[PDB]
From Swiss-Prot, chain A:
Family indicated by similarity: Belongs to the FlgI family.
Subcellular location: Periplasm; Bacterial flagellum basal body
Oligomeric form and interacting partners: The basal body constitutes a major portion of the flagellar organelle and consists of four rings (L,P,S, and M) mounted on a central rod.
Biological role: Assembles around the rod to form the L-ring and probably protects the motor/basal body from shearing forces during rotation.
Residues of the whole record sequence present: 20 to 73 of 365
Lineage top rank: taxon: Bacteria
Protein name: Flagellar P-ring protein
From Swiss-Prot, chain B:
Encoding gene, per UniProt annotation: flgH
GO terms classed as biological process: bacterial-type flagellum-dependent cell motility
Listed name of the protein: Flagellar L-ring protein
Domain of life where this protein originates: Bacteria
Purpose of the protein: Assembles around the rod to form the L-ring and probably protects the motor/basal body from shearing forces during rotation.
GO molecular function: cytoskeletal motor activity
Disulfide bonding pattern of the chain: none
Recorded family membership: Belongs to the FlgH family.
Keyword entries, A-Z: Bacterial flagellum, Cell outer membrane, Lipoprotein, Membrane, Palmitate, Signal
Protein location: Cell outer membrane; Bacterial flagellum basal body
Subunit structure: The basal body constitutes a major portion of the flagellar organelle and consists of four rings (L,P,S, and M) mounted on a central rod.
Native source organism of the sequence: Salmonella typhimurium (strain LT2 / SGSC1412 / ATCC 700720)
Entry coiled-coil feature ranges: none
GO CC field: bacterial-type flagellum basal body, distal rod, L ring; cell outer membrane
Keyword Oxidoreductase applies: no
Length: 54, 58
């Protein structure tokens, strides 16, 4: 059980994924949204997608 | 029966026969102008009021 600990197999590799999201349900410890316009912009985007146009 | 109707979603037209309000507000204005000019003035003169004798023939 040492070769598996010393080498890696060609083609058997890991990639990296990134994305943007919103986290809700905080107890008043979220963004101020006055210094972060993108939070409100993306919340409006989500609401518009769901059918609400602010 | 008028089918499923969302509760909190804004009232939007979804099917044939639904109504929608259009606020006509058009304001289009285009303009263009150009010009070109060219001028040329030329004056030339030469006069011998008094000609000395040795220059007379010329």
């Amino acid at each position: 059980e040492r070769i598996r600990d010393l080498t890696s197999v060609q083609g058997v590799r890991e990639n990296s994924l990134i994305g943007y999201g919103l986290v809700v349900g905080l107890d008043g410890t979220g963004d101020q949204t006055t210094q972060t316009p993108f939070t409100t912009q993306t919340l409006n985007n989500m609401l518009s997608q769901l059918g609400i146009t602010v | 029966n008028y089918g499923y109707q969302p509760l909190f979603e804004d009232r939007r037209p979804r099917n044939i026969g639904d109504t929608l309000t259009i606020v006509l507000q058009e304001n289009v204005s285009a303009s263009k102008s150009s010009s070109a000019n060219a001028s040329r003035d030329g004056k030339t003169s030469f006069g011998f009021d008094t000609v000395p004798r040795y220059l007379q023939g010329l």
